[PDB]
A paper describes a structure:
Increasing the activity of the transcription factor Nrf2 is an inducible cellular response to a range of inputs including redox and electrophilic stress and various intracellular stimuli. The main negative regulators of Nrf2 activity are the proteins Keap1 and β‐TrCP, which target Nrf2 for ubiquitination and proteosomal degradation by interacting with degrons in the Neh2 and Neh6 domains of Nrf2, respectively. Inhibition of the direct protein–protein interaction (PPI) between Keap1 and Nrf2 has been proposed as an intervention that can increase Nrf2 transcriptional activity by stalling its ubiquitination and turnover in the cell, thus prolonging its half‐life.4 Recently, several approaches to inhibition of the PPI between the C‐terminal Keap1 Kelch domain and the Neh2 domain of Nrf2 have been described. In this manuscript we describe some of our recent work in characterising the binding behaviour of short (heptameric) Keap1‐interactive peptides by X‐ray crystallography and in exploring the SAR of analogues that incorporate unnatural amino acids.
One of the early approaches to developing Keap1 inhibitors was based on the native peptide sequences of Nrf2—sequences 1 and 2—and related proteins (p62, 3, prothymosin‐α) that interact with the Kelch domain of Keap1.8 Such peptides have high affinities for Keap1, with the most active examples having IC50 values in the nanomolar range. KGaATo date, co‐crystallisation studies with Keap1 and peptides have used relatively long linear sequences of 14–16 amino acids, as well as one 34‐mer sequence, with only one example of a shorter cyclic heptameric Nrf2‐derived peptide. We soaked human Keap1 Kelch domain crystals with peptides 1 and 5 to determine their bound conformations, with the aim of observing the effect of shortening the N and C termini on the conformation of the peptide. In each case the peptide occupied the binding pocket of one of the two Keap1 proteins in the unit cell and entered into interactions with the vacant Keap1 Kelch domain through polar interactions between the C‐terminal carboxylate group of the peptide and Arg380 of the adjacent protein. Otherwise, the peptide are oriented in a similar manner to the previously described ETGE 16‐mer peptide23a, with the exception of the Asp side chain being positioned differently due to rotation about the Cα−CO bond. Peptide 1 is involved in electrostatic and/or hydrogen‐bond interactions with Arg380, Asn382, Arg483, Gln530, Tyr525, and Ser602, whereas peptide 5 has an additional interaction with Arg415, but lacks the glutamate side chain that interacts with Tyr525.
Author numbering:
A (entry chain C): 2 to 8
B (entry chain B), C (entry chain A): 325 to 609
Write the structure that this text describes.
Amino acid sequence: DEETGEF
Amino acid sequence: GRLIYTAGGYFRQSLSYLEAYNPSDGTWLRLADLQVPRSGLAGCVVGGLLYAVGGRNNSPDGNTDSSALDCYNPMTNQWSPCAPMSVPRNRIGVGVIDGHIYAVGGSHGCIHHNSVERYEPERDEWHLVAPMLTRRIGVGVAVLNRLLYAVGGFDGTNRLNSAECYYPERNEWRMITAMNTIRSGAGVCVLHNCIYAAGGYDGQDQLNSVERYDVETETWTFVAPMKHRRSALGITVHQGRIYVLGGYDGHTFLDSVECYDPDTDTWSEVTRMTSGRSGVGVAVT
Amino acid sequence: GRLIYTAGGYFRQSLSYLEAYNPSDGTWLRLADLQVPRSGLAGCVVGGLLYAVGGRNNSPDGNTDSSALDCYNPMTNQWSPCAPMSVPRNRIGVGVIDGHIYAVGGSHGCIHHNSVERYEPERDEWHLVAPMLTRRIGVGVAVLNRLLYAVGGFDGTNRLNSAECYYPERNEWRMITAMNTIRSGAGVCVLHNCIYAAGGYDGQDQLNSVERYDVETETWTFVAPMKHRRSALGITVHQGRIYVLGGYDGHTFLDSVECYDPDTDTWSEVTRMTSGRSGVGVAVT
Ligand SMILES: [Cl-]
Ligand SMILES: [Cl-]
Ligand code: NA
Ligand code: NA
């Protein structure tokens, strides 16, 4: 999530 | 006339879009959807077909890593599947040499791969080649001088600034000079005779710094940074410019495309994507 | 006069809500928020207190699976933290036997647990019991005949239709007849002498089918389907009917609440929830 923002 | 394809991505969930941008006339085409959505997939073009490689399908009710190789024919507007790789690879990086696709690293559950493998399209077959010295995911890959460069990434524990390099004839890896910045999730390409590493994430913040490598000198040196910090972005090269598409900036998912003219060492906002997203695959045919 | 509680959940983001439906008067209650937002938690009532176990906090600040055990007193409208579990468990399953809380399976990052552990509310302590035969996340848990039943789920590679059964006196797990459908994130409950499984996700579509298990028959026969396909639905029983609450249908996050009447093998829509959501925890007071 901090490199791509996914959950 | 050449097109900039973007495939997949992620916004709220992994996505199925294939869209192309025409950089001369400024228009976006909506093409056939991917059968299976993915983000952190990688794109490339080999002999007229466009290939979508790897990725992961993040749905609200489950994730599954892709091992898939998917093959889009612009003249039929049709996807269709090709032989899959030996393992699933999320946050893969990809490069082409002599018409063979190299799939380097990426994640599969808890595995952070260092294995890499090479697809021969004439045979619809994958075979493994020498693994990297480093486990890398969210890696950047570029071809320069018929060598494969694997830049930055994440090894399951540390985000990287190291970079190593593969010799196809010899089938061996060698580390090369490390980057000034730790970069997991950067965009990496070659333009003129240098390898650029744009944005990414350093462990604290998403970046807009761009540094570039030079085989002559054997050093990384920064150039003009992008307007927008971004990580998990798409990158390709068209005419003589770098094009970055998309990404996560820490707060929102960008629809911004930025173009880098190296003659002037400046970036400009050319077009915006039909909707913001991260983790696209990008290629040019 | 008893209440159906719904806790946390997910819509764009993990949720904090604690609301309570009154099946008699048909009204909704807004009770004290949770302290950390959570989707994929489970709820249970033991001792006139309400317990919210594990889950995940998807915020725009990051992911973190929970090992929290949070405890709501309804006479004070107050949540207090109780002792946490050994291990974060997202997409957790819970069942109570003899006023002891069994936390079954679930995920922590990349790890898919088969660990099980049992909370003693008296001592405020968690201890492990015999781990189950299969890694299971998104598992449904039901208690029937003083036995603990873990139905379906996802094991990190495939979604499952296997079920298995815990013997607390003996501290061991034995496998039972598998379901007809493979279901991760279904709603599993006990009604009459039947273990019901409604809804879920088979890595592919969402489900509207419902089957029940029959320990004498040892088979899994199908019954009437739900109006809506629901994965990560919340389930509970009250006054001789099954209540399913929200979920994801593949397209939107349902606020629908359906009620199954076993006398007539039919479902009907009772009141909708205030906002659609999925991955809630549900208990009856
Ligand atoms: Cl990811
Ligand atoms: Cl693997
Ligand atoms: Na990361
Ligand atoms: Na990436």
